[PDB]
Every structure is written in structure tokens, then in C-alpha cells.
Scaffold this active site. Structure first.
Site, short mmCIF file in Angstrom:
data_model
loop_
_atom_site.label_atom_id
_atom_site.label_comp_id
_atom_site.label_asym_id
_atom_site.label_seq_id
_atom_site.Cartn_x
_atom_site.Cartn_y
_atom_site.Cartn_z
N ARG A 94 1.33 2.82 0.77
CA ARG A 94 0.40 2.87 -0.34
C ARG A 94 -0.99 2.56 0.12
O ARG A 94 -1.89 3.39 -0.03
CB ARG A 94 0.77 1.87 -1.45
N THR A 95 -1.16 1.39 0.71
CA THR A 95 -2.49 0.98 1.12
C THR A 95 -3.16 1.95 2.10
O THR A 95 -4.31 2.33 1.89
CB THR A 95 -2.52 -0.48 1.60
N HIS B 288 -5.76 -9.78 0.17
CA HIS B 288 -5.50 -8.35 0.01
C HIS B 288 -6.41 -7.98 -1.15
O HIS B 288 -5.94 -7.54 -2.20
CB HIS B 288 -4.04 -8.13 -0.38
N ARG C 86 -5.78 -3.51 8.54
CA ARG C 86 -4.66 -4.32 8.06
C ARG C 86 -4.09 -4.97 9.31
O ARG C 86 -3.85 -4.31 10.30
CB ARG C 86 -3.60 -3.50 7.33
N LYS D 47 -2.62 -2.26 27.19
CA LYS D 47 -3.43 -2.83 28.24
C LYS D 47 -3.88 -4.23 27.94
O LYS D 47 -4.73 -4.75 28.63
CB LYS D 47 -4.61 -1.91 28.51
O1 LIG Z 1 4.08 -6.08 0.84
C1 LIG Z 1 4.16 -6.36 -0.37
O2 LIG Z 1 5.25 -6.40 -0.97
C2 LIG Z 1 2.89 -6.66 -1.14
C3 LIG Z 1 1.73 -5.76 -0.73
N1 LIG Z 1 2.14 -4.36 -0.73
C4 LIG Z 1 1.29 -3.38 -0.44
O3 LIG Z 1 0.10 -3.58 -0.14
C5 LIG Z 1 1.85 -1.97 -0.49
P1 LIG Z 1 1.99 -1.13 1.10
O4 LIG Z 1 2.66 -2.08 2.07
O5 LIG Z 1 2.83 0.15 0.74
O6 LIG Z 1 0.63 -0.69 1.57
C6 LIG Z 1 1.26 -6.15 0.65
O7 LIG Z 1 0.62 -7.20 0.76
O8 LIG Z 1 1.55 -5.40 1.61
#
Ligand SMILES: O=C(O)C[C@H](NC(=O)CP(=O)(O)O)C(=O)O
Ligand SMILES: O=C(O)C[C@H](NC(=O)CP(=O)(O)O)C(=O)O
Ligand SMILES: O=C(O)C[C@H](NC(=O)CP(=O)(O)O)C(=O)O
Ligand SMILES: [Zn+2]
Ligand SMILES: [Zn+2]
Lengths: 153, 310, 153, 310, 310
Positions: free
Chosen positions: E54-55, E134, E105, E84
Site C-alpha cells: 500500500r505505502t 508513519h 521506509r 558492499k
Molecule cells: O504494518 C502494519 O500492519 C501497519 C502499517 N501498514 C502499512 O503501512 C501498509 P503496507 O505495509 O502495505 O505499506 C505499517 O506501519 O506498515
């Protein structure tokens, strides 16, 4: 009113009386269609004789009538079976079953690699009366199987 | 709207002759007359849950040749399915809220079908679901046969290799049965024969097909020689006996062939087609692959475009 | 042995009859002890109301005898139920379950690490009236579980 | 023949108070006057499908100290049971036809008992069956307690550590609940509590027991401080919270310890018993260990020799 | 320049109410009035060092819906960091010389923050740093709450599941404390409770919040029911006890709920929301996900665009 003889059956005012169940297919239909939920009288005659058909099972549930696709579901498990709908101690509705076009959510695809096992979906099978071995097609994997292969019980 | 506007391309069994013909005629037109902006502003998800080079790169190349954008994952290990244990149903759901069309390749059969159920109004394209179907492969195949043999009728097609787990040959037969006069020669090791369901349909259709122990016999009789790879990743251990191409093609056996016959192969090719074949004017696996470009471009234009003047 | 609310047909010469099986229990006992796995005429009557016991169960089983032990196996589900001895339409002698000392087979030890699951050996549990419930002890692993958790087959 | 002749030693729930007495007596008797030919001509199996140092080596030494011969395996990795898919029942089926007695440790509760169903007439000695019983460990603990408290009746026993999987506390406790006056104190984390079946039993015999949050609540009034390891290898992954020791007997906390109070531990120990305790006069674990030779020699003389070794 | 021009979006604790409000108002506008060329010629790095569907896909889909380009890696294993042994500092440095904005991320907390220190003048966006923050999740959440409840004030929000390692619920509380009249119901297994630092702030703020053992109690009292997934990948082994959703939602418990309450979830959902919930008019996790599109589009337009007439 009447009295089907040859052997001993049971009294019923209103309700479905399934007759001509093949050998031992009674204990099965009893759970495959969860008939034991009904808290209403349930007569059951096992291994009763029957002309050239000898022993036959028989289930009887007064005040209960088979749901729509139940008789259709009752085709694959007992082709020659007969559904008798009763009321006022009468056979107000004799019904013979026909194999339907498709069996939903009851059967389980034999293909291990079929996505239905893993994912949350109701299994659906196309019913093709391929000559004499009912053909079953999986809506998902498009595979085809001999009805019995699919039919463990 | 056109015939395949917003439709899902899940299985050849669901398309019709005219449908197929619309793709090729369209493909033909795109092949000689580019449309850089046809899919401008569209965002297409290229979701591959299984290995790929031709199918994924050709498809994404097409998306680009039409001004479309592509978002996606080439590994389900970095998604939240292969990590957080999300169901595919949930993955298809959220994704269908972002994109315009979803292209998908999955390890198990019925995977594409299942997505149509959670994708709302987003058309799903089957880049291959297990060993069930591979529709776009067939569209690119039909085009290659048509452009080299000038017809999809009365051909003599021989299919060789893993016919059981071969999703490409399942999609190709159901297609070629839609046309008239085709005769099928099936050459496979018994543990990997053509499924019965496909044959039953050939029979129902009244179509001539035969079994053979080698190409040698039908060689000077075929128009198309569709070669396939043993689907190693899918064989059950009891089948491991067949992991070696049992029927291999060398330049030598192409001696009495019809001077018009072509040798096709979805690739990758393991060791079933000796390299010397590559120089004979019969080898057509690389031009075939090249065609995936025009076939998929056509499919994408048709599914996302209502009317299309070309 | 006369009985009439609604005229019927329900008699037998020999056989056994488990009467007084409390509601619903009749179906369970059907599978557990495999009383259904015979060519012998069976007649079950789930939910058939009778007397102050009202809703009960009843299994007329033709030409079949159970043992002291066998009948005792029933105590764990149908205690007040009482096996009645038929024969020649005559009631030879009304039996009745009594807590058996050991439940051989049927049950399956709930402990995951118990040798029973792996090895080809019939289960066996020591039955025991534990305070309010009935505790069971695996012969093998020696773990005691409340009868309300131990499963079977 | 003596009472324990040719009998299986599977569990402390099967033996009587008297039987325990006969072992501790013969053990003491055997400690005073060695009998190097008592089992001269016998062949005993040391079969361990699970890790072990003391139990095995001591059992094996015992066997040697009486002229017995030994054969067996340290680990199932190279037994046909292991590489050729073979049932434990068939293993014991065949083995009971070679040796005169079988000693075994197994990872699953009930393995020894199983053995007693295919060993024919050859007896089986349970060296530890999962988290169930460790019957010979008890004989040694008892022999030791009696050696240091003078009695086995009217004692105070604090059991610390993992009582849930601690097979040594299962046997030992059912053993001490056969004498009189022994009051118990259970000190363990809720998730590794003493199993219900042993408490029902304690209540039954009218025996008194009591839980506590720490050793302090029993230190000045316990004669036996039976410390135990945390059964790391059996713990459900859902209980990993208790992997490390919650109670560490440091030498200091033996500050208000009763004079005759000794610390016992079946071993191996991790971090629950600080190494400085090794120097306080209460520490008796290694003396405990050494006693294994006598309780074990005692048991094998009683099971394989018709007449009380004098 | 606008308020968030060229700013880093590292943590909700660094943004203000007005800031948040500018995003949503903007998002609202983009949602109903597309801007295909707004980010034309911009190149955005989508750097995910941790799983995502999703993110990552929503963000990249947004980049595309604005005419922007995306360069990036969805696996740090193929980079030169995971091979490396390059430091993240060096990775953020070289990359900040190629692109216009960096989306990131990472597995560990403080990872985004650290990048702002080596990225020069390139704005960094936190797609999630460990179990710290987040932010974009919260922007999409605030928008979903606002569009369904018509207010971000005086709401009744219940947060369920892993509140400790949940970065989504850390970013959401700090946000909802910026508004007025919100009351928080915290429902979590003790080993996974809300961190103290977040609560201290609620107190400092003078905000009402309470603890509960189940939804049942607050069920007919909430407006928003924020469900969360146990952060399995982060739990310490001692916490492994909680890897099973302890509080699960079925259609059945939604019986006395306010006919306006919605059930939100950042997803993926393990087994904490039974599928039957999906058909109740309360389930809003898929529409919520859909909103990530408009929220992130707004954030990107604001950070890279000075003035913005819409
Ligand atoms: O992982 C979760 O359950 C909560 C939250 N979920 C998401 O952001 C969705 P995703 O991992 O699909 O990008 C996160 O912090 O990753
Ligand atoms: O894999 C094969 O050999 C046949 C066929 N091959 C392809 O589609 C080519 P690719 O795997 O490069 O996309 C397939 O079904 O994957
Ligand atoms: O292992 C323990 O913690 C206690 C006990 N240990 C022993 O008997 C000594 P060993 O494990 O060296 O043979 C057991 O249950 O096996
Ligand atoms: Zn299937
Ligand atoms: Zn057991």
C-alpha cells in the site's frame, strides 16, 4: 393419510420424508446436510429391505423441508433418492432430483495448487453429465474431475 | 464501446473467435501505426508473483509505448503479502483502488479469476495463473502463426514437450479450435500428456488430433511446430523422471519439412531446441517474442479504450 | 410393550435398545462407537419426545448385543440412558451404563507430544470421577485432562 | 525372587513406598560392598534418543561396575529408526531379542511405557520420557536426601524452577508423597506451574503444599531446596517469556538457611544457581550426582538378579 | 512559498494542526480536480528498505498521477548497502544529488530523521521508520475520519491491537491531540500497551483517555474503531506470547454500534477482523486505503510546489 407398507416406517403430520437413500448414505446425509440441527422429531430407518434394491436407508424429519439447492445437492450423493413433501399426513409434494448446473461452496477442489484452498472463497463447480462419470469443473483452476474423485463422501 | 472494453482477459475459453480476430487486426494496425499517447494518464499495475522476463518486460514496454505509466512489484517477497501474511484477496482489493488495469502472474491456478472478484471494475489481465492459462501468450502466438502462414484455418500444428503443465499449449488449443480445419499432432511423454479436459473439447468440436512418439513422423507434414519446456517448477517428485527434454530439435531433423513451416517456442528454452536450429529459416522463436509487443499493446488499447479509430 | 400417541409400526424380535439417551447425544454416540457400521437393521429416533424425560433419543438396533464393558462406554454420554435387552420381542433384561474403568480406542490424547499419535498403538484412558467433572488419564503420557476437552474418533 | 525382579521401572506412580525403600537399602548396601560380577554375562542397552550426560554415563558406569556389557546409541541420528523411517515399536521389537534389559530416554511422553509393549519379557527402564517421568532420577534424589537429612518423612521441600515440564519434580514429588509429614512449597512462574494431576493427588493424600513468590518465604524452614533448570527445549514458543531463570539462588540468600538445609539440582544448571553457592556447606548437587552410581547399580541388581544381593 | 514547501515530513510531532488541515483541504481539492502535470519533470526516489504494498504502490501511483517520474529500489539487498556494506548516510548522500524528493521506509527508528542530515536540500518523506512514526498513514487516516464523520474534533476513537510497536497509532494520537474534544479508548494486551511518552503528552494536553479489556464495553460508544496488526516482525521473543490477535472483530459485535461508526485499519490485516465485517456498512478499510492516493498526492504537491492555486 395413507400407509406405505412392506416394513415399518413412522407417523408424520407435516414434513419432508426422504426415501430411497442408498446403503449407509443415511449417516452421511445426516451430517452432510446437517439434518441433526432440527430439534424436531427425526425418524431414521437404516438397512430396511427394498425389492430388487434390498437394504436402503431412510430419513424422516417432520415439520422440516429441504432448502432449495438441497435436493440438487442430494443428487451427487444419492441419484435414485426421492423427496416426499408431506402435510396433513399427505404426500402433497413428490419430487425427484436433477443434477444442477453447478455445486457451490460444499465440494473441495482436488487440485492442491488450486487458489481456493488458500484464499477466502466459496468453491464452485460446473456439473457436466459427461456420459456416465459426472464431470466436475473447478470455477477457479478450470480443471475437470470425475465426480467421485471430487466426491470423497 | 468496443467488444473488449473493460473486460477481464482471464482465459481463452472465455473469448470468442471474433474477439481473438479483433486483437490481431488491431495489433496489425498498431504494429504499423504507433500511438504514443493512446494510454496517456493511465496507471497499470504489473503484479508478478512468479518469474518473468518476456511476459513482464514486453507488457511493461507496451504500457510505455502507449504513454501509460507502470507501478508494480516483480517479487511478492517485498510486498506485505509475503511478509505480513496478507491474503491475495486483500491485495487485489487495495490495488484496485489505485490503478486502471491490473496485469498479474501467479504461482497457483485460478489466481487471476479470483482477482476479478475483488477488483471491482478494474479489468484484470492474466499474465499466467499456474499451469492453467496464459491468454496473452496465445494472442501473440495466433498473430505469429497468422503473419507467417497467412491463415488460422486448416493449419497443421504439432505441439511438443510438457503438454500437461504447459499453460501456453492449453490456451493455444482452445484458441485454434475456434477456427476451422486445424489438425493437432500431440507429441509428449505420457506423464506429461495433454489433459483430458482439453481433448474432450476437441472431440466435442469434431476436431482431428493424433498422438506420436517423435517429430520425425509428422515433420514433413506440419506448418507450425510448437515446442515447449518441461515445467520443472511444477512437476511432482514422482514426475521428476521427465525433467530432461525427451524430444529435442536439431537442424538435422528439419530436412524434409515444408519450406514454409516455422518453429515456435514461448521460451525460455532449456535444451529442447539445439542452437543450430536458430540459423535455419524455420526458427521463429525470437520474432515470435518480438510480437508480444504488438499483441499486448492491442489488448491494452482495447480493454481501456472504448472506441478506437485506426 | 404397548405405546400409542399416534398409531405407527415400531417393533422387533431380538436386538438391543438404548433408551433414554438425552437429546442430541444420540447422534454423537452413533459415530463414536460405530454402531452404524453394520448391515444390521437400525432404527434411530432423534428428538422423539416421551414422558417427563420429554425430548430424548432412542436406538433400536436389531440382532445386536453389547457387552458389560461396551454398555459402560456409554456412561460417558448417556448414563441415565439404559440399554434394554430385547429378544423374541421379549425384554430379556434392562441393562444400563455404569462408569467404565478404561476407555480403549475412540478417544485421542490431547497432548501433542504424546507417543500415542506417532506409534501404532490403540489409545487408552483411565476414567475417573474428578470432583465435579470426569478426569481422564493417558495410559501412555500420564496426563490427566477433563473429559470436556479430550477428543476422539 | 525379590520384589522388583524383571519388572519395568516406567514411573514413580507404579512403585510402592516399600519398593523405594528396597532400592535405597540395596543402594547403601552396594555402596559399602561392591560386587563386580553381579551382572557378569548380561548385555544391556543404553538407548538415548535425547541428549544426556549424567543419566547415561552414570547408568553405563553402573553396568560396568557389576560386570555387565553395554551396547547402544548416543543419538538416533544413525539408527534405522532415524534414516529409514522406522517405528519405535519395531525398533524395540527387534532390540528386545538381543539384550537382557533396555534403558531409554526419549523426547515424547510415554515412550518407555510403549517399549513395555514390545520388549517381550526383557524389562524396560525409563531414563526420562519427555516431560513425564524420570524415575531413576528420583531414586538418586531420595537416596541423597535420606543420606543428608537422615529421614524421608516429615520434611519441608521447596521446589523452584520449571515444575510444568520438569520431569524430575514430577517423579520426585509423587515419591515424597508416599512417606508422611513431608510438606511442600512450590515456587515457579505461573506458566510453568506444577501440573494439576499432581496437586489433585497432593490434596487427596491430605498432603500440604503452598505457593510462594520467592525462596525467602521458605529459606529458613525448608530442609530440601530442590532447584531445577527451565526446560528450554520443550517450552511452547508461546511461553518463551520464561526462558531465563526467574529465581537465582545466590550464596548470600543462604543467610538464614537451616543448618541441615542442602541445595539439590538434577542438572544441568544454567544461571539459576550462582557459582559461589558451590562453596557454601548447603550445596550438595555434585554429591547428588555422584550418588547416581549407587541408586543405579542398586536398581539393575534388583531387576536382573533373582536374589537380594547381600 | 506555502507552509510545507521543501519541508521534511519526518514526524507528526513536528507538524501543526494547520499543517495537517492544509494537507486535507488540498487533498480534498486534488480528489475532485486532477493535476496531470503538477510534478512534471520531477524525479522522486521511492526507497523502501522494508516490505510494502500500500505505502509504496500508493505513493508511486501518486507520483505518476502528477506527471512525476520515479526511480527506486524495493529491496535493499540489491543495492550497494546490502552488498558492499555502505552506510545509509552515504546512500542518502549520493541519492540526494540525483532526485528532487526522497520517500523512505526503513527497518529502524530514526532512519528518516538521519537522512535529513545527509540529504542537503532534498525533502525526505517518512514512509515509516521502524515502529516510531508513519506520518503519511496519519494524513490518509485524518482525511478518512474527516470525510466520514465530518469533524476531527470531539470524536470517540478506540485504538485496538499492538499499540506499542504500532507506528500508525503513534502518529495518529499525536495528530488527534492537536484538535479539540477527542476522547481515546485504548484496548491492548499489556505487553503491547501504548508507550508512556505518548500518554504523558495526552495528560500534559489535558486529554481524556481510558484503558479497556475488550471492544464490547466501548462498542456502542465509539465513532472510529482503529484496528491494528500485532507487529510480529518487531516483537522480542519474550513477547512472542502475543503473536495471536487477542482482540478480534466479527460482524456480530457491531450490533449496538452507532450507525455512523466506521472501522478503520492500516492493513494488512492478519486475523483481527473477520471477513463478515467486510459487508457491514461499518467496514471502511478499503476506502481508507484508497484515500492514501489523494493524501500523498497532496503532500507531494505541497512539498515540491511553492504556490499552488486550486
Ligand atoms: O504494518 C502494519 O500492519 C501497519 C502499517 N501498514 C502499512 O503501512 C501498509 P503496507 O505495509 O502495505 O505499506 C505499517 O506501519 O506498515
Ligand atoms: O515458462 C515457459 O516455458 C512457458 C511460458 N513462458 C513465458 O511466458 C516466457 P517468460 O517466463 O519469460 O515470461 C510460461 O508459461 O511462462
Ligand atoms: O535436563 C534437565 O534439566 C534435568 C534432567 N537432567 C538429567 O537427568 C541429567 P542429564 O540430562 O545430563 O542425563 C532431565 O530431565 O533430563
Ligand atoms: Zn480448482
Ligand atoms: Zn497421552
Amino acid at each position: 393419510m395413507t400407509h406405505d407398507n412392506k416394513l415399518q416406517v413412522e407417523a408424520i403430520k407435516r414434513g419432508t420424508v426422504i426415501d430411497h437413500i442408498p446403503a449407509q448414505i443415511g449417516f452421511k446425509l445426516l451430517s452432510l446436510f446437517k439434518l441433526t440441527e432440527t430439534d424436531q422429531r427425526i425418524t431414521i430407518g437404516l438397512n430396511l429391505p427394498s425389492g430388487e434394491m434390498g437394504r436402503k436407508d431412510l430419513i424422516k424429519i417432520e415439520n422440516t423441508f429441504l432448502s432449495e439447492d438441497q435436493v440438487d445437492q442430494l443428487a451427487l450423493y444419492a441419484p435414485q433418492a426421492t423427496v416426499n413433501r408431506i402435510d396433513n399426513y399427505e404426500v402433497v409434494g413428490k419430487s425427484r432430483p436433477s443434477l444442477p448446473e453447478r455445486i457451490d461452496n460444499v465440494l473441495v477442489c482436488p487440485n492442491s495448487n488450486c487458489i481456493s484452498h488458500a484464499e477466502p472463497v466459496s468453491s464452485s463447480f460446473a456439473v457436466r453429465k459427461r456420459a456416465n462419470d459426472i464431470a466436475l469443473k473447478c470455477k477457479y483452476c478450470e480443471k475437470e474431475f470425475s465426480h467421485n474423485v471430487v466426491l470423497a463422501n | 464501446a468496443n467488444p473488449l472494453y473493460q473486460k477481464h482477459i482471464i482465459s481463452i475459453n472465455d473469448l470468442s473467435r471474433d474477439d481473438l480476430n479483433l486483437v490481431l487486426a488491431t495489433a496489425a494496425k498498431l504494429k504499423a501505426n504507433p500511438q504514443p499517447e493512446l494510454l496517456k494518464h493511465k496507471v497499470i499495475a504489473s503484479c508478478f508473483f512468479e518469474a518473468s522476463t518476456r511476459t513482464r518486460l514486453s507488457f511493461e514496454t507496451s504500457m510505455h509505448r502507449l504513454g501509460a505509466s507502470v507501478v508494480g512489484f516483480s517479487d511478492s517477497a517485498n510486498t506485505s503479502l509475503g511478509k505480513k501474511g496478507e491474503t491475495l484477496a486483500d491485495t487485489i482489493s487495495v490495488i484496485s483502488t489505485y490503478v486502471d488495469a491490473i496485469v498479474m502472474r501467479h504461482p497457483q491456478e485460478g489466481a487471476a479469476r479470483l482477482a476479478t472478484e475483488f477488483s471491482g471494475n478494474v479489468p484484470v489481465l492474466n499474465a499466467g495463473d499456474g499451469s492453467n492459462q496464459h491468454p496473452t501468450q496465445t494472442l501473440l502466438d495466433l498473430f505469429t502463426i497468422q503473419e507467417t502462414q497467412g491463415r488460422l484455418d486448416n493449419l497443421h500444428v504439432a505441439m511438443v514437450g510438457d503438454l500437461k503443465y504447459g499453460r501456453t499449449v492449453h490456451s493455444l488449443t482452445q484458441a485454434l479450435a475456434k477456427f476451422d480445419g486445424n489438425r493437432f499432432y500431440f507429441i509428449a511423454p505420457d506423464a506429461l500428456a495433454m489433459p483430458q479436459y482439453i481433448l474432450d473439447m476437441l472431440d466435442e468440436k469434431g476436431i482431428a488430433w493424433s498422438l506420436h512418439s517423435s517429430i520425425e513422423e509428422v515433420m514433413a507434414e506440419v506448418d507450425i511446430l510448437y515446442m515447449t519446456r518441461v515445467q520443472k517448477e511444477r512437476l511432482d517428485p514422482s514426475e521428476y523422471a521427465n525433467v530432461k527434454a525427451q524430444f529435442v530439435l536439431r537442424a538435422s531433423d528439419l530436412h524434409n519439412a515444408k519450406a514454409n513451416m516455422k518453429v515456435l517456442h514461448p521460451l525460455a528454452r532449456v535444451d529442447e531446441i539445439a542452437t543450430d536450429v536458430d540459423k535455419t529459416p524455420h526458427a521463429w522463436y525470437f520474432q515470435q517474442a518480438g510480437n508480444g509487443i504488438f499483441a499486448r499493446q492491442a489488448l491494452l488499447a482495447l480493454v481501456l479504450n472504448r472506441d478506437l479509430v485506426l
